[PDB]
């Protein structure tokens, strides 16, 4: 995914 | 051949390193033998070796802290000639600042010959005292004399060495891409890495969705190490080792950003969690991107 | 439908924006009409619209500066009911903080209906005065009344919009790879971007081979904008737009690092040279990597 | 190359  | 890099230069006979006294940038500052602490930054004792094009096994030696060069006073071949820090440049033709560095007869330590005088860097009398004179002295390449033998303890990696350390790690995603930013990196002890983190203000930063989340912590840690490098050292031509990675969990449904550093032996990476300052061999993510 | 994002909400009848008075986080702080300056950050006038799952065209509206939510006082359907900032959460079931936002009869402006009361956000009497009351008022979805019509001026991009802006740029290398770090980004006017740069200490930084070179300037600018975001705004769930790119010249024999931002229309990128603070449509490099 |  998108780095959280 | 000795490779371009940052060295801690340690006498073969006694545990004294080549030290630029008080880190001073003054011309004629004495270079002396001094005790050292392993697994620290020895602030006055790091030397950047720059190979000279078309002169075999010959180098300038720049003190990382002062930005001044190891200099044989007036290029004299007299035994006892002062070795001092002096202003210069990485590729000078000044023979006072040019040093041929090749393996000793022991085959692990090196001798350091002034290119002009053909005399050797000598810890006078093998004195282990803090502040002991280092001088240019008569010598030969093949003799055993430990006054003139020096271990070049490599404190830097090339980008190619960093690339190898990442590649042998077992937590690298199949899609991984790495982006190299510099050529030669000072590897920090974890104690120093941690100090930069403690001093960065990150320990006292709150995790906040998107506005200050893992990517912000990781980029902030990388900026903090970049700033520390420039602020700490006067020499040029090297960077400080501090990577940023993006990773994805095993389930492929969560991603994170974090930092990484290198082991003492320079062979493997170690992950750094910039929210809590932990070091980890497994951070729970496989890296798909790195920049360093 | 209105998309998730940051909005500047401007009355259709008079040039007053929805303003949380003095940016105050106090519960019951009045929301008022106030004049504004285009191409600035209007600090008290930015609203993060968060869609509510399984409630059609319905949103919380969080003031970016205060982190408090647009709230219809006690959910009253009486005409004249106070609209105020109040503590809440992005996905509350509190109907006082839930707002159905759909296109007006004009088809460009929106009306803002409280989900509980079914009354509309109303600039009372169309008063253009700084500090003019905004209230919940009787109304209908289809009427022309400009007291209840609001332009949602979009100040953020999604990561997909940023990705499109990069892709239409003519200075992208064939090997380009982009790494997205967040979901929704506040786009800065160049005047604000520049102020963050001026305040970062970069203008007074010296270029130094590897130790503080283009990659250090670009990462430092990105960290400075990240810090500014967290320090400036109390809301969560968005990031500030500031990219880092690596690029290679036409001859393929030199590389550089730099930053990038977005045009006012959000359709194209603009390059930012962090050593001198210049904006450029062509920086002399084709980008092979970006993170943002 | 390497960003200089
Ligand atoms: C203990 C001592 O070690 C050697 O003498 C060293 C010096 O050795 C160097 O200089 C001498 C001439 O003074 C000679 O040229 C020798 O090949 C060369 O390595 C020197 O290291 C000084 C200063 O530290 O200390 C000692 O005098 C050896 O020659 C001596 O016989 C004696 O064993
Ligand atoms: C100039 C004025 O505009 C309209 O009146 C508005 C109000 O309009 C809203 O409330 C009224 C009842 O008070 C009615 O329900 C109407 O459909 C609705 O839009 C309101 O915006 C207030 C506060 O700003 O100002 C005006 O009174 C219109 O109905 C009036 O005839 C008159 O033309
Ligand atoms: C910057 C300074 O570093 C240390 O003092 C240096 C000193 O450091 C070496 O010797 C000390 C003992 O005197 C320890 O073994 C260190 O591990 C060595 O790195 C020398 O370099 C001398 C002469 O040049 O200069 C001193 O400043 C440390 O003791 C100081 O607190 C300080 O951090
Ligand atoms: C943070 C503060 O912002 C400005 O004052 C705000 C004010 O800003 C709006 O109105 C002014 C004129 O009063 C300009 O049109 C700005 O472009 C608008 O953004 C309002 O938001 C009021 C009421 O909430 O609060 C003031 O603080 C600026 O004038 C201040 O110098 C300061 O930067
Ligand atoms: O003194 C300034 C110079 O320092 C270095 O060269 C000198 C050399 O000319 C001679 O005076 O001997 C001294 C002591 O050994 C130095 O090696 C630089 O290489 C010069 O460029 C100059 O800056
Ligand atoms: O007052 C604290 C609460 O604020 C919000 O809810 C209130 C609501 O319960 C009622 O008192 O009416 C006011 C004014 O309209 C607010 O909407 C939060 O949603 C609550 O969770 C609570 O924090
Ligand atoms: Ca570089
Ligand atoms: Ca972020
Ligand atoms: Ca993120
Ligand atoms: Ca660098
Ligand atoms: Cl011998
Ligand atoms: Cl009408
Ligand atoms: Na001297
Ligand atoms: Na050479
Ligand atoms: Na109030
Ligand atoms: Na919805």
Residue numbers in the entry:
A (entry chain EEE), D (entry chain EEE): 1 to 4
B (entry chain AAA), C (entry chain AAA): 2 to 293
Could you share sentences copied from the article?
The Marasmius oreades agglutinin (MOA) is the holotype of an emerging family of fungal chimerolectins and an active Ca2+/Mn2+-dependent protease, which exhibits a unique papain-like fold with special active site features. As additional feature, the MOA dimer carries two binuclear metal-binding clusters, symmetrically placed at the dimerization interface (Grahn et al., 2009). MOA requires the presence of calcium or manganese (II) to switch from the inactive form to an active protease (Cordara et al., 2011, Wohlschlager et al., 2011).
In an effort to validate our substrate binding model, we co-crystallized the enzymatically inactive MOA variants C215A and C215A/H257A with two synthetic heptapeptides mimicking proteolytic substrates. Unexpectedly, co-crystallization of catalytically inactive MOA variants with different substrate mimics resulted in complexes of the enzyme with cleaved peptides. The observed cleavage products correspond to the N-terminal proteolytic fragments, binding to the MOA active site in the standard backbone orientation expected for PLCP substrates. The synthetic peptides are anchored to the active site through three main contact points: the oxyanion hole, defined by Trp208 and the backbone NH group of Ala215, the ‘site B’ Ca2+ ion and a backbone–backbone interaction with Ala256. The P2 moiety binds to the S2 specificity pocket lined by residues Leu247, Ala258 and Leu182# (with ‘#’ identifying a residue provided by the other subunit).
